Write a protein that binds this ligand. Structure first.
Ligand SMILES: *[C@@H]1O[C@H](CO)[C@@H](O[C@@H]2O[C@H](CO)[C@@H](O)[C@H](O)[C@H]2NC(C)=O)[C@H](O)[C@H]1NC(C)=O
Ligand SMILES: *[C@@H]1O[C@H](CO)[C@@H](O[C@@H]2O[C@H](CO)[C@@H](O)[C@H](O)[C@H]2NC(C)=O)[C@H](O)[C@H]1NC(C)=O
Ligand SMILES: *[C@@H]1O[C@H](CO)[C@@H](O[C@@H]2O[C@H](CO)[C@@H](O)[C@H](O)[C@H]2NC(C)=O)[C@H](O)[C@H]1NC(C)=O
Ligand SMILES: *[C@@H]1O[C@H](CO)[C@@H](O[C@@H]2O[C@H](CO)[C@@H](O)[C@H](O)[C@H]2NC(C)=O)[C@H](O)[C@H]1NC(C)=O
Ligand SMILES: *[C@@H]1O[C@H](CO)[C@@H](O[C@@H]2O[C@H](CO)[C@@H](O)[C@H](O)[C@H]2NC(C)=O)[C@H](O)[C@H]1NC(C)=O
Ligand SMILES: *[C@@H]1O[C@H](CO)[C@@H](O[C@@H]2O[C@H](CO)[C@@H](O)[C@H](O)[C@H]2NC(C)=O)[C@H](O)[C@H]1NC(C)=O
Ligand SMILES: [Cl-]
Ligand SMILES: [Cl-]
Ligand SMILES: [K+]
Ligand SMILES: [K+]
Lengths: 936, 936
């Protein structure tokens, strides 16, 4: 078709990434390289053995929790694909560009260790097929002709595993273009072998395949060694013994001295593969765990037993178990039969729509190998009987591969068909592993690896091959599948767990550039799949899971330390520099800030001619209001230029540092040399903070001695600060008589705290006495609430809503409604009428109706010129001082500033007549955009 | 003494904390309440049993790793004591005030669960002594008189454990003052019992205590049930059988039909406690692990064995094992014998020097119980033989407590002496546990617990007693020591691990208010002790350690979520708000910032009359310089007041947001409405950032069209910015021809980058071309280095140091030394001469000499008026443009600004003649306080 001349199941790596600085639909580029790294030697060498030991409903469940593991990791990888633009280079560049260089050096290094131990599991599966089924005469170590054949079997896999690994790691050094060419014969040998196996089980429902086994009375024998079973060889006229007699008795002379189990029992011959038609699921759907050295023993037979001490004599031709078996041992052997799901992203800079091919091409290439493994375990447990399943190496059927004796041609279709694919999977993983190590050490995220990025011309790793040919050597010296198999399955389960974790902590915390766009992500499938990866990590080996999880987390913190040492300059200083910046960039997203207002505060203090703070008691009121929580920035302004008044600001800086550590204030300090104090104050209200760590209110003193002279632009700077916060939508706390405010160890014995509503923000006016009584100074004071009502309304019902609001919150205050009818209150009500419904649009976008419009007053209660007739607060101040003149703290809402600046001094002498004969006052001012629904 | 009338080993709790808002030396207040909660029932009921099974050198090692665990946790608790002022209230307030409310609600809640399961381990030890040694006739359940006595033993501990727990949880509800009075009889019963046991082993070296056991030929018998052993009862004239015969044979008729092991074997009588003098350490220093149901079998005897199938008949009077035993089972039973180290901080608001009593009073009260347990295991394995150690409940010695048969009076000194102390330890822990739950729910850190802080008058918990009397019930229904014992030992190991971890991550990261002042802290002892707590957590039960560690970490994140929901207002927004603030407060400590300078940058951009950025190519030069790393703040200034020009700043804000996301800039934006641009720029240079997240350099354009007119205060604002950064010690990058600078996808094919030194900062001048070539635009350009030398020096050697500097760093540049002799260079050299040695004091406090003064040039190389004779850069510019006129980027150090402002326009036309006929120039300016030793 001339498009299949570019098949290439190999991964891209580093060379196709650097050349993208300056064709493959779904089937040929994603789906087929994924259905070629998934199918492997466990399907042809171990899946019959685990269904004979676990049975169905224990193999059926371990193929259902090992496949539902990798299905949920496949969803999390499809979110990484549909995030950015899918860079060219493979799976290392596609993950570490959407999860950061820390979650990419840890997934990227647990993956190189997984495939370099998979590459030892394929060379181990090569010599198993070459020594047990192809050529069992090349075996160079024959131990003693005794029961000590286990050690010579291991020492034969160590001299041939080394000789194959040397020749395999020198084919991919000179013949890389040839191994790329031969990638289509490997996919054919896999796909032909699976079609052969499903072929013969449809033939078996009509014609069974005729493989016979021989039982010495409920004991399975090894057919290698004798010809005909029969025990007698009747032969016609005279009878002479068989060769089966010659292995159990003293000689072939027919006289005497045979052994005891041989003499009291007969022999039998049954069909080892009794077709799919025989009702063999029933007597094969339960477990049969065995111990090392146990005869396999077909159940349901006669077997007169010796009932003696059983000197079983491990030299007779029996079939013994070679290892003890249980459920959690089988999961670590079966698990590498589902790995290979990062192969759908091998060719990511070759597709035409890589955000559509990588999702559907790996979800379908997983759901179709699940339909093979689930249907193989039912059909193997309905066509073969148990004692032929329960031995590997096929001793009951004369040295034939047990899955091979089910194919439509002779069993050499599967024996050669598995020999080449296990050779072409260890040639693949010995190229894809030293490519990924070369891709890691070019990025420089791990600085000691940096000589494993060197190559020859045209890429093609030269030193990373030498390291991979030594790590794969120590899986050859172990020399056993069922030992190398659960080791690599821990490394693959580790990297599938860090992928699932990183994609779930970023959707919750809302990291900035992360959009999955997939369709079915929902953040919990990546969390539920993480909960299955470490569950399966524990039941393979908890002493393996606990050490592969610790050094993965100990290279995560080596990326962050070395990455911050070059980003900011020094190491341990940079970890906190990087943690603050990343938390700030997370804040700027776009959704609104908060639906429960909390004063952040920005304290404006004044210093004097030798730079000491003028009123230090303003800083102790912040300590009694914040109690260490939130943000607090203190700011002072000097006059002059920076160029010659800067040492006057070095020591004005440290005098607020030394004083906010003595009044126990937790926050930051900013000292600014402006040319005048009018705009230098106005700057700090604008640029206070960094990003989302910005202030919310201003706390400033009162401009006392304003009326005299010689401070003429001090009270004109005050009224311009009231207008700058109404336009900037901040809030305002101004404290009159700052020197009368208590220090930290003074502790008012009793008394009260009065609040006056009038007709404005109560959520801001009930929260401030609430927060004050969490301090040891204001703990013992009561709290009385005075609200001013007009008339023509009711008030009688207004106080009822006030009482249940305190009942629903347990504040234990008391209310009293004072009433005006004439123009006593007009600086509050007259100038604005629409704020009642202007407040409503602030709470309509708030989107809370179910029991959240309760626990929030103001709304539950809502039920003649400044210039020289004007506003008069004498009738208002006379009713305030009649009931609050000795109350330790009064809280008032101050009225809104006038429009035209011709009434800027009629406004200041409204605030003096309002608050006369009152000792400690604190005037508040709203901003409209404050709701408080939960009172801490 | 009338000071011992205030002994009170009970903990303080919540009442003594709220009353400290408004006498006990070391021995009586720390040391003795610590030597009373440590000594317990494992010393009297299980320590003999574990030394008979493990032997010495396996009991010797598990008392050495369980005591060295709690010794290192005792050091970490002595750092918490010598940090603040040691508040009043106990151990909950002392930890959660120096480790935060998150490491205090997790240590504080794993501790309440530990003592409420210790309180079930004492009521279980009460009914064991009352049913096996005191009154073995109160047993209300007698099963079948068969081998099914294990179930009736458990059902007898469930009806008496419930009846004692009801009466114990109603003594501490009405008689709390009496239990406080009786705390001195409990310390006496403990201290008298230990003096009794060490007494009898000195008597045993001269007089053994005479306790006899009887062996049926290598089989230990149960002496309860028969009187004299002897098997015959010769009696004088006629012989009639014993009662030992009557338990093994059919009747007492002397005829026949006895059992087979009884008939072929004799009986024997040996001393069960053969003194300290017998050489019995040898035949007792090795393990003897047994299985459930095994006869104990004293080794080294004759014992003609049956060699048959052994119908052992578990109804004969034998001594059988009741459980199977191994090494990691014994650690979970032995471990609660060292807990009780938080008792030295029970009375913290009662001492006189609490920072000196709590260290020495718990270190010595741990080192002296280690001398008891280490010396008990040697002396128990030299005075008792193995088959009396290897049975609990004392069946071989006729129902006597095995540690009781070693005391100087009759063994009832230990039997009553342990009955009262285990009763006074379950009365203590049933008061200290519902006090700590009441201390937790007053703080409000866990909001659903808040009804367990309610009390009656005078404190004294009323509902927390009801919860503790139901959690302790489910340790009564388990009804077995050796089952409740490893459960509580997991909770105590959990809280000792979070204490050790929190004290090691704060010393490394340098959290602000943390000073240990102790003497021997060194941060690694708290880390090495953490490495032993979770090691011991795994070898008790890994399926218990894995679930007690998960819900401890799942209340840590419940403290942080609910604590940030009230600190900032909304929940998941506040986690990132709190993480940014805490990382910023960590930065302000006092040590200097960095010894490897990295440009942080602060870009000053200009907008126009409809608020679009004037030169957008200044923002792409930051992307090509930072590449996403570090901090970058862009700042623009408008003219006017805030009160009417603020919507002009809303949309000037979003036009830099929409443009710094398109040029791929990562950072923050600040727009400021000043009254003039001179001080509004000067403010941003001062207050740029928050805390330690502040800028380091300024990147600004060039004031083109300065010479004409109508922009007269634009170039006067420029030269004032050069002086404001020299005084403020910042650094400066000014770019000429900003529109000629390349965009992001333009990718220079080849070319060069030239740099000219002259005679100043090269660390800042080699780092900027280094960082530029990490981008795809400047990757392919070369890098030539031109340095200007004077004369009378050498230069010949200067270029040699330049070449090895690039050899030691692999930059692949080339150098060339151009030379001047006359006054060509005088704007650089003439005005300042002392900067060579002024630089030296900057690097003397740097404190780096060992190979760090290499890899840092500038120092390795150091080997006539401005006003209208002046400075002339025509001879300098003619040699620049001869060699660099087509070089894609030139870098120059600009000279220092003049002192007097009369030469402010002779300075600007020095910068125009210096940089004429050059297309892309970038002038740099130092600051003195920049060293770069590692070039990324
Ligand atoms: C049973 O064993 C005896 C050995 O004692 C066999 O006896 C000899 O067998 C050889 C075999 O060729 C003959 O040449 C001898 O003549 C036999 N000698 C005697 C004394 O019998 C005997 O043949 C064996 N039984 C059978 C049936 O072969
Ligand atoms: C071994 O096989 C033989 C078959 O020849 C069994 O012999 C038969 O046993 C049954 C049951 O006792 C008898 O009814 C038949 O008459 C026997 N057949 C002959 C030809 O004699 C023998 O029982 C089997 N052994 C065991 C232990 O089952
Ligand atoms: C194979 O034969 C043995 C006898 O040699 C069977 O074992 C006996 O099994 C029964 C089952 O109830 C027990 O009661 C006997 O005690 C066993 N006897 C001995 C000597 O162990 C065995 O069951 C057979 N195998 C299978 C799979 O059934
Ligand atoms: C051995 O057992 C026999 C029972 O068969 C005993 O014989 C009887 O024992 C009773 C016991 O008092 C006598 O009254 C009978 O007279 C005995 N009868 C006979 C026929 O002996 C016998 O006594 C037992 N052996 C001994 C030594 O007591
Ligand atoms: C049980 O104890 C008796 C002691 O009466 C042992 O009998 C002695 O055995 C030794 C060794 O055979 C002889 O030398 C003595 O003569 C025996 N003593 C008498 C009085 O006959 C008897 O051996 C012991 N049983 C076992 C199994 O050791
Ligand atoms: C108690 O006696 C038994 C015999 O009843 C001893 O067991 C034998 O131990 C030897 C040791 O080498 C073995 O060779 C035998 O096979 C054992 N016999 C049986 C029947 O098990 C046993 O050793 C004695 N106990 C101790 C602690 O020594
Ligand atoms: Cl994979
Ligand atoms: Cl403790
Ligand atoms: K497979
Ligand atoms: K103890």
């Amino acid at each position: 078709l001339s498009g299949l001349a570019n098949y290439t199941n190999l991964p891209q790596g580093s060379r196709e990434h650097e050349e993208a600085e300056n064709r493959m639909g779904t089937f040929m580029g994603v789906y087929l390289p994924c259905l070629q790294n998934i199918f492997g030697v466990i399907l042809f060498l171990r899946l019959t053995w685990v269904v004979g030991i676990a049975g169905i409903m224990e193999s059926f469940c371990m193929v259902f929790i090992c496949c539902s593991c990798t299905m949920l990791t496949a969803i999390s990888m499809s979110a990484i694909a549909t995030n950015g633009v899918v860079p060219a280079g493979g799976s290392y560049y596609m993950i570490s560009r959407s999860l950061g260089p820390e979650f990419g050096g840890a997934v990227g290094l647990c993956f190189y260790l997984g495939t370099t131990f998979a590459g030892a599991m394929y060379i181990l599966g090569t010599i198993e097929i070459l020594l047990a089924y192809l050529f069992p005469a090349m075996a160079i170590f024959k131990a003693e002709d005794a029961s000590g054949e286990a050690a010579a079997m291991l020492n034969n896999m160590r001299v041939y595993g080394t000789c194959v690994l040397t020749c395999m790691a020198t084919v991919v050094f000179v013949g890389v273009k040839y191994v790329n060419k031969f990638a289509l014969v490997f996919l054919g040998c896999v796909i032909l072998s699976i079609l052969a196996i499903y072929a013969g089980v449809i033939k078996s429902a009509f014609d069974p395949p005729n493989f016979p086994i021989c039982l010495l009375g409920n004991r399975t024998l090894s057919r290698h060694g004798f010809d005909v079973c029969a025990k007698l060889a009747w032969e016609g006229n005279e009878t002479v013994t068989t060769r089966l007699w010659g292995l159990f008795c003293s000689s072939r002379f027919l006289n005497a001295t045979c052994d005891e189990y041989f003499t009291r029992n007969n022999v039998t011959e049954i069909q080892g593969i009794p077709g799919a038609a025989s009702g063999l699921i029933k007597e094969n759907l339960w477990s049969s765990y065995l111990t090392k050295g146990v005869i396999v023993e077909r159940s349901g037979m006669t077997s007169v037993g010796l009932a003696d001490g059983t000197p079983i004599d491990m030299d007779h031709p029996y079939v013994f178990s070679d290892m003890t078996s249980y459920f959690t041992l089988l999961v670590g052997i079966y698990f590498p039969s589902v790995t290979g799901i990062m192969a759908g992203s091998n060719r990511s800079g070759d597709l035409r729509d890589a955000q559509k091919s990588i999702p559907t091409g790996t979800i379908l290439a997983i759901a179709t190998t699940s339909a093979v493994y689930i249907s193989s375990v039912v059909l193997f447990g309905a066509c073969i009987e148990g004692v032929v399943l329960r031995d590997k190496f096929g001793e009951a059927v004369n040295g034939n591969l047990v899955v091979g004796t089910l194919a439509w041609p002779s069993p050499w279709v599967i024996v050669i068909g598995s020999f080449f694919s296990t050779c072409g999977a260890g040639l693949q993983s010995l190229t894809g592993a030293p490519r990924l190590l070369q891709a890691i050490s070019r990025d420089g995220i791990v600085p000691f690896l940096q000589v494993f990025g060197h190559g020859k011309a045209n890429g093609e790793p030269t030193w990373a091959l030498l390291l991979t040919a030594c790590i794969c050597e120590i899986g050859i010296l172990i020399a056993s599948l069922d030992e190398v198999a659960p080791i690599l399955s821990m490394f693959f389960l580790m990297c599938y767990m860090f992928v699932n974790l990183a994609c779930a902590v970023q959707t919750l915390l809302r990291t900035p550039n992360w959009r999955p766009r997939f369709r079915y992500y929902h953040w919990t499938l990546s969390f539920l799949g993480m909960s299955l990866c470490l569950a399966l990590m524990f039941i393979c080996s908890w002493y393996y899971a606990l050490v592969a999880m610790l050094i993965a987390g100990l290279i995560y913190k080596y990326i962050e330390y070395r990455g911050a040492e070059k980003e900011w300059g020094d190491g341990i200083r940079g970890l906190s520099l990087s943690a603050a910046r990343y938390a700030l960039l997370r804040l700027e997203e776009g959704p609104p800030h908060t639906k429960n207002w909390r004063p952040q505060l920005l304290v404006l203090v004044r210093v004097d001619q030798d730079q000491n703070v003028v009123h230090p008691q303003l800083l102790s009121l912040t300590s009694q209001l914040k109690a260490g929580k939130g943000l607090t920035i203190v700011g002072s302004v000097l006059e002059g230029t920076f160029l010659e008044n800067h040492p006057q600001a070095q020591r004005a800086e440290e005098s607020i540092r030394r004083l906010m550590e003595a009044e126990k204030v937790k926050g930051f300090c900013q000292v600014v040399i402006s040319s005048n104090l009018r705009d230098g104050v106005s700057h700090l209200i604008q640029s206070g903070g960094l990003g989302g760590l910005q202030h919310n209110t201003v706390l400033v003193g009162w401009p006392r001695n304003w009326r005299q002279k010689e401070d003429h632009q001090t009270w004109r700077n005050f009224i311009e600060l009231v207008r700058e916060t109404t336009a900037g939508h901040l809030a305002l706390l101004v404290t009159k008589n700052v020197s009368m405010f208590p220090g930290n160890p003074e502790r008012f014995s009793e008394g009260s705290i009065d609040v006056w509503w009038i007709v404005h923000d109560g959520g801001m006016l009930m929260l401030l006495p609430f927060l004050l009584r969490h301090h040891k100074v204001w703990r013992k004071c009561k709290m009385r609430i005075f609200t001013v009502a007009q008339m023509d309304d009711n008030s009688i019902q207004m106080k009822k809503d006030l009482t249940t609001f305190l009942y629903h919150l347990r504040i234990t205050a008391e209310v009293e409604v004072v009433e005006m009818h004439e123009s006593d209150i007009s600086a509050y009500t007259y100038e604005k009428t629409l704020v009642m419904e202007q407040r409503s649009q602030i709470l309509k976008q708030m989107h809370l109706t179910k029991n959240e419009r309760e626990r929030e007053i103001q709304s539950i209660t809502d039920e003649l010129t400044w210039t020289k007739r004007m506003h008069t607060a004498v009738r208002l101040n006379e009713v305030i001082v009649k009931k609050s003149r000795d109350a330790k703290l009064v809280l008032l809402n101050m009225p809104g500033p006038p429009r035209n600046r011709n009434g800027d001094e009629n406004y200041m002498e409204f605030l003096e007549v309002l608050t006369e004969h009152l000792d400690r006052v604190m005037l508040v001012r709203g901003g409209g955009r404050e709701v408080i629904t939960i009172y801490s």
